[PDB]
Amino acid sequence: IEDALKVVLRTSLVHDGLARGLRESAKALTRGEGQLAVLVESVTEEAISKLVQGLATENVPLIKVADAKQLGEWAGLGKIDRDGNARKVVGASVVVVKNWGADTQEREILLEHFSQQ
RNA sequence: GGAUUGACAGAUUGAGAGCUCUUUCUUGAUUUUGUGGGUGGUGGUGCAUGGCCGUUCUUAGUUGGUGGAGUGAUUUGUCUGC
Ligand SMILES: [Mg+2]
Ligand SMILES: [Mg+2]
Ligand SMILES: [Mg+2]
Ligand SMILES: [Mg+2]
Ligand SMILES: [Mg+2]
């Protein structure tokens, strides 16, 4: 669901849980750190997503949200001083949640559903 | 899918300075390059200034209010004496 994802990105931006990028994400997944991972499939040459999946096999669950630019936009990378987007382009293309922070019921039901697959 | 940061070892250096290079590794939006602007300056101007001190001047010297003399600038009061 769309709500739980923004909730978890807020709970990990507040307590510094987002591994904003792929090297930090890879290091977190290699360690016992990365508790969640959202990545976009609209990536050229597709090897980064394959590497993310392989590191995920190894901290298991992953999400497959598209729209890398939008993913970064609602991932909190923007300073977003105004109400509207005040930056030309900003993206993440991989986001890893380390610290779960505050917990909401809808989000935990969603992650349990995604774990069940 | 890296604005950037930092560095072992060597060349380089006076340096055990990752200053610069060889290679690579680390770091995460604080930054980096341009514009405006701002700071810092035992930089200049004491002949732009303050404050302070020095000196004229260690002497006894100044000043204005009513009043008098001058058209007036000024003067008397601030003096002949002791
Ligand atoms: Mg100075
Ligand atoms: Mg002077
Ligand atoms: Mg005097
Ligand atoms: Mg008179
Ligand atoms: Mg007189």
Automatic annotation (TrEMBL):
Protein name: 40S ribosomal protein S12
Organism of this sequence: Kluyveromyces lactis (strain ATCC 8585 / CBS 2359 / DSM 70799 / NBRC 1267 / NRRL Y-1140 / WM37)
Keywords for the protein's UniProt record, in alphabetical order: Ribonucleoprotein, Ribosomal protein
One cellular component term from this protein's GO annotations in UniProt: ribonucleoprotein complex
Domain (Ribosomal protein eL8/eL30/eS12/Gadd45) ranges: 4-96
Family: Belongs to the eukaryotic ribosomal protein eS12 family.
Domain of life per record: Eukaryota
GO biological process: translation
GO molecular function, one term: structural constituent of ribosome
